[model samples]
Structure formats: structure tokens, C-alpha cells
Target: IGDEPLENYLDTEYFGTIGIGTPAQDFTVIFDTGSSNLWVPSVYCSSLACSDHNQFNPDDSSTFEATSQELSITYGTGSMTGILGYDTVQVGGISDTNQIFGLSETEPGSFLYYAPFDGILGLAYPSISASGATPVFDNLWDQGLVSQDLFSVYLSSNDDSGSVVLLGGIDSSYYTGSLNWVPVSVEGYWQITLDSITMDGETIACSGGCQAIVDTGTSLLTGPTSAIANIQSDIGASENSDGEMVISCSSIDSLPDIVFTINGVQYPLSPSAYILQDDDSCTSGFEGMDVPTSSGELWILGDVFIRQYYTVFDRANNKVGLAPVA
Candidate 1:
């Protein structure tokens, strides 16, 4: 129903502020679509990860209600263990009463310790939610807070600002031409069937087809190690001392575009779109990780791909809409 302005942090992740509990304690949270659970550090947490971040004090909220149910969630880099609680959750001027969320008592690993956000608000399906807790987006829809059962995301590149997540509707001003709708192949994540991946008319990865998740939570495009290594070699990149693929910034102009075919539509990403430039260094955005699903190999289309396209997550018809960003 409203646009939530997101802060683009180094073009790696985007997050926004949300209020929780009665008096409305503001916390910066990542609106993740890869997982389905809303959690924040609580006063009970004494971990190093929680030391520098905002914590929710249940005693300070007039409408806070605690439950004995414990919750656990493990991410690619961090994990959290917490107890369940209910309170008023507010986002972008819309408030949901009696919303269940996790109050983290422990957050393990150094990944979260250095993260800019204090918590995560997941936007995926309820079926994949941890501890069976309904996600924030589901509550917004079930509560009739949104006129439509959909949301759209626009991620601005190079940290130029204007990044936003629009709830309940699509804003045409953010994109050009009509949207190309693709049906979801899976109900859990915003997953769809990828037709193929090619460079210079030659198939490089996902030759036949594969399942790809349009994940806002992930920062890089990830696939099998061999496939990604091939791409790195094709682009004349080398592994640096830090094990990251590095390419000369001067070579970007000569690199070919990598095109992703989906549902008979071709979406191309230029070299500039897939390279992360910081000062004098340029790093390839592709990472290697084999995520095997029952259906097939899983490829993650992360921020690298999203920055070039406007995305719409539609729950009403179980489809996703994509368009070139205007």
C-alpha cells in the first residue's frame, strides 16, 4: 500500500527502518525474500552480534506478549536463536496488530556482528517460515491492509538512492514498457524456471534449464563452482589473494554481456552491471555454491541481476513480473 524507501549499503544490501511493539521501537531491518521469519535482537541477547545493534525491550512495550516457543534460523553467514513474541508491527505507515515475531536471545557468528541492519523482516511465503510463524507480507495481505496481493522492488545501482519496496501495487514509473510476467515454478521462494544463460550466443551456464530464485536477500549471483569458474575465465578474471574474482576495471568495456533467458524472454546484464567497483578494484559479482533442489540445480539471481530490472512478486496469481528499469 505504500513505498518503503531502502538505504542501499555499498550496493551490497538494502534495508529500511520498521517499528515494533506498542510505543513503536524503530529498528533497521532487511526486507528479505529468501527466508520467511521476522526476528530482532532482544534485551536478553548478550552475544557480540547484538552488542552494537538495537534491541527490543519487551518490558518497555505496553502491548508485548511473550510465549515459551523457541525459534531457530540459520542463514548463509549467520544464525539466530530466539523466543516467540507478539506485538504491533509497523512498516511504511501500515501497522499490523498481534504480529508474531522472534526476539533473539543469541546470534551466532561474526557476519551479523558487522552488519548494518539490526534485524530481518522476511517477505517470502508462509509455507517456508520458521517455527510456522507467518511472515510480515502474509499478515499484511491477510489483514486486508493491501488492495492487491503483490509487491514490487526497485534496487538502485551504485548506491545512488531511490531504492524502494512498494507494497500491494506496482509503480510503472520505475520501469519501461509493459512487464513480462513469468509463472512461479515453486511456491516457497520467488523461484522460476530459467531457460538458459549465454554469453556471445554461446551457452555458458544453465545450458538446458534450471531453477532460479530471485532472492533479494543474497548479494551476488551464485551457481555451481564449475559454472561460475567458467564464467570467470571467460571474462578474463583471476582469483585475487582474498579468493575473490578480480578483473581489471579497464577491461569492463571489452567484456561481453551475459544474457539470461527466462520464459522465452532475454534479459541481458552488461559488464558494468555484474561488476562491483570499489575505488580502484573491480570484483566479479558471481559466486560459486551448489544449491541442489529436488527439481534441479538452483541458481540465485541476486542484487547483481535485480539492479538492471524492476521485479514484481505476485502472490495472487503465483507469478513474477519483470521489466527493464527506467
Candidate 2:
């Protein structure tokens, strides 16, 4: 569990430090378990930021090969809109062969375009819903070289260190607790009802009308804006200029344990998972919760919640297992 091969989110945009160098022209991407698709930016795009990205230059290296098919992907994140087209791909120490991939031609200007990664690596395995397509997991499964039939992830909203995906197999060493495999909807997505989120066995009725979708791609707990207000009220905090919630400038170590309860289940949220850093007034931020807006639907449980438990993305088994933190 301690000694495993490496995995990283390749950025072909300016989003983060996906590559070795600065603004090293990378692409935007992450290990998404939401839906199955590996899409990224391409060289033949029309944007100044696109030009700054480390586009796929098929002729650049001996490893510069492609899947040569017309593919595309559209996501809910507006910053990086849907992309179109295909190109060579190199992942898991292997290059793509006659594969089809999504390439965003025109995307919003962001740090993603300024990064150095070239594409995204999907952890979702193909299924009937996907009609047996070529997902990133499919590629790994096809090679019969991965460690396990499934993967697990945990995320934190405390900082850029909010996400951590365990490839190959589950880290069995730390998984000493029982598992509650949550059932997904017939449509094939993890859907569960969250009665309320508590802290240290105390119930916090702050969260209401909440529906949670366990999406590993999202790093924040995105829920109703009102949910944030209620949560802040529970934490005895005040809203800031941006209307964002923050802890007062003092009680850093006194931050209560995050206990998110769902259908009588309590999931402990570590301090590292939230309250990343605070000001002198303890004006620290919080993780994104799977909340909805005034009338929004599909509240996503992104990285914030993922970091708390050992999440099993058993696409092969068509099930998801969640356990206490490792």
C-alpha cells in the first residue's frame, strides 16, 4: 500500500502544475469517476490560452502517437466547455492506437489552459449506459496490467491537496472497518439521501432538501447556497464579501469534527479535509458540500466528501463501497 506506481492528472491547460515546468503548456484534466470519457485539449484549437497549452503535437516525440478518430466530450463545468476532435494518446506507460478521444477546440480562458498536462485520465469503466465505449479504465483493463478490478479515492478541500486517487487497487492496509456499499440509481450514478450532517455525534439540522451525488471529479462540496448559510450558522461563523462562509479568526484547533450523516450513517470529516487555512480572526474557508441552489438539481458530492472515506469505485461490480477513513 505504501509502495505503488505513480498516477497524476495530466494538464494540457493552465489549470495546475500537471507537467514538470511552469505554465508548461498543459491541459485541464482529472481522474473523473462521474461518467466514462477521457477528453482533453488539442493542438488545433482557436484561443490565445489554447496556444499557451501543451497541446498534443503528434510529431513532437517518439511517444507522439494518436488514436486518429473524431471524438468529443461536454461537461457541466462551464469554465472548460465541451471539446471536439481526436489525437494520439500516451497513458499508463502506453500509447493509444487507433483510439477515439475528445479534444476541446474552444474553451474558456483559465489556469487550466496555462498548465502543462495534455489530457484527462478517466477512472470510469465502460458499462451498458456507456454502451461499452473506450474509457480510460477500459484501456487499463484491456492491458490486464492493473492491480485490482476496482479503485478508490479520497479528497480534501483544505487546499490544492483536496484530491487523492488510489489506482491499481484499494489500500487494504488502512481499510479495517466495515463497508456500506451504496446502491446507485438504475441510470448508473451514485445517488443517496443525506438526512443531515453532524459533528461529534451532535445533529446539525442545517442541511435540508439535500440530494447527494458521489462524484469524484469534483473537489468541492457543491450544494445549495442556503446550505452554506445554515452550515455557517451551525459553525458560528460569518459570511464574507464574496458571500462565502468562513470560521472566525481564532479557534483553529477547536474546529469541530465534520460529521456528515446520511440516512443514519455518520462519516467523519477530518480537520485536514476542511478549514484549509484561516486568517488571524480564524476566517478560514470550508470544503464544498454536495448542496443545491434555490432551484438547482443534481447536487454533486465531489472531492470534499470523497476524502473522508475509502470510496470503492467498483465499476466492474456495478457498485460503490464507502468505509471509514484509512
Candidate 3:
């Protein structure tokens, strides 16, 4: 009736525990907003990625039922090919039956092979779901398992513990002041319209109208190569031999805040949040990525933005909300 809190993995990704099948075989899964379709490593998988993580065996579960449908999904990091199946799924002490999901027989990539979580639980709309299967969260809402039709995410730094994703409600204890609410400019990918990007009171990135996706699965702040490179230059970060933008760790305190404007409200990212320290050197969290777009290139605000503000995905009203942590 209430909400279930998810845990972050070493500040790399945030995942939640969900039980599958009749007797409830537990597995850790990333609660992702980037993509749809829930999937787990199947017992029939032969991939090395599946071998290192938890695999779902349909034969062992009493409530398992087979589906004639097949499912496959590809992403920037990797791809997954599998068969569709139905089973009883449990999350945060709530239960739902006939939940549709993919059992991955072939997961090809190192991204998932070395990942800390077993699978992904898609929180986006059912439109993106493959094989015409409904996502786990949609089932929770349809079956009236939660108190509200929304979820909030609170990610933290690696040095600190206690990050959480509250499903079905916003916990006021996790945020401060009033929430800044904005309508979803696009339906897919939790996309929002970003007004502009600024650093040291100068507009450095996304000067034109740009689309931004709030992705919890990604680890860095990604934007168009030209835009991100400009921001890196403004911060005095140089491209190192490793092809990464790095700066002297001693100059971190002298850096200015990188601010992003969304729906006319300015959100500032401090030096500590935008810089990644690796021993004596530091790397800029802003990664130059090429994203396809009709207007300006798409921008992705990952952990770098999420860790600073508690975010809420309001599916009921088609909007995204942000607030400082309380």
C-alpha cells in the first residue's frame, strides 16, 4: 500500500530487490527509466554474462508459465535476446501474478557481464515494452498494489550510504523546499525540454532548445560532443592520453559550478559533484557523447544531476519534479 525503497550499488547504479516465481527467488535489478521491458538471465542462457549473475530457472518455479513470444532489445552499452514468460513477481512485500517479463538466453556485452545488478526493471511507459509485455511497475499500478501512481529517486555519493527510490509516493524526508514541477516535453525516456546550460554565469552548453533525458542507469553526464567539449574547456579540463577530460586535483576547489536550466529554473552542479577524483588527478563527469536529434543533440543527466536533487517521476500527470534533499 505504501512505497518500496531501492538501494544504490557503490554509487554506480541504483537497484531494487524483486522476487520472481511462486516461492519467490530473489534477485537484484536496476530500476531504470531509460528503457522498458523487464528481463533477467535465464537458466538456459549460455552467455558468460549470465553465468556471473543470478539466472531464472522456469522449471524450478511452481508458478512459471511459458509464452510463445520472443523478445530482444538493444541499447548503447549492449543487447539482450530472450524468450517471454509469465510468473508471479514480488517487490517490497507486495505481490502480483501473471507478470510478463523476458528471460534472457543471450546477453552479449561486458557492460551487463560486469554489472553489479542481475537484471533491469523498466519504469517507463508500456509503449516501449517489447513483445507486448507489460512492465513490472505497470502491473503494480494496475493491480492496485501501491498508494500512488508515482515514484521518487534519491541517489547519493559513494562515500555515503542510504540512497533510495520510493515507489508510489514521495517521502518528504528525502527532499527540502518546494518541488520544481515541469511537464514532460516528450513521452519516451523521461525526456524534458532544457532551456539552456551555463557555467560561471555564461551560457556554454545547450544554448538552443535541447531535449534532456533523466537516466538513472547511466553513470556520467552525457551531451553532444561539441557542447560537452565546450563546457570542459571552460573548466580548464584537458583531454588526456586515455581520451578522458582530466584536470589537476589541486584545482578542484577553484572550479566554478555548472548550471543547467530546465523550465526556467536553474540547477547548479558544484565542483565536487561534476568532478571524479582518481588519485592525484580528476576527471570531468561531463562525457562527450553523440546523440541523434532533430533539433540540438540530446542530453542525458545521470547520477551527476540526480545525486544533487531528489527526482520524482510522475507518470500520472506526465511531469518530472525535482527538489533539494532535506
TM-score of each: 0.98, 0.70, 0.95
The lDDT, on a scale of 0 to 1, for candidate 3 is: 0.84
Choose the strongest candidate by lDDT.
1
Each candidate structure's count of clashing pairs = 1, 47, 0
Error of 3 at 152 (Å): 0.6
Query: Local error of candidate 2 at 138, Å?
Result: 3.1
| C-alpha lDDT values of all predictions | 0.92, 0.53, 0.84
Candidate 1: global Cα-lDDT?
0.92
Q: Return the TM-score for candidate 3, rounded to 2 decimals.
A: 0.95
Model 1, C-alpha of 83: deviation from truth (Å): 0.6
- Over 1-326, each residue of candidate 3 has an lDDT whose tens digit, in order, gives 44555776656677878889977888899878888788899888989999989999898899999989989998878899999988998866678788888999999898898888889988887777877689877888888888888888888785466777777888889888899998998776799999898887778878776898999888899998888878888878897788778888878789888888989998889898888775567778888888896655789989878899999999899899998776
Tens digit of per-residue lDDT, candidate 2, span 105-177: 6656565565444455555545521324477555555666465666766543323332445545676554568
Report how far residue 256 has shifted in candidate 3, in Å. Answer: 0.7
Q: Which stretches in model 3 have alpha-carbon errors above 4 Å?
A: 278-280, 294-296
Give the top-scoring candidate (TM-score): 1
For candidate 2, give the lDDT of residue 19: 25
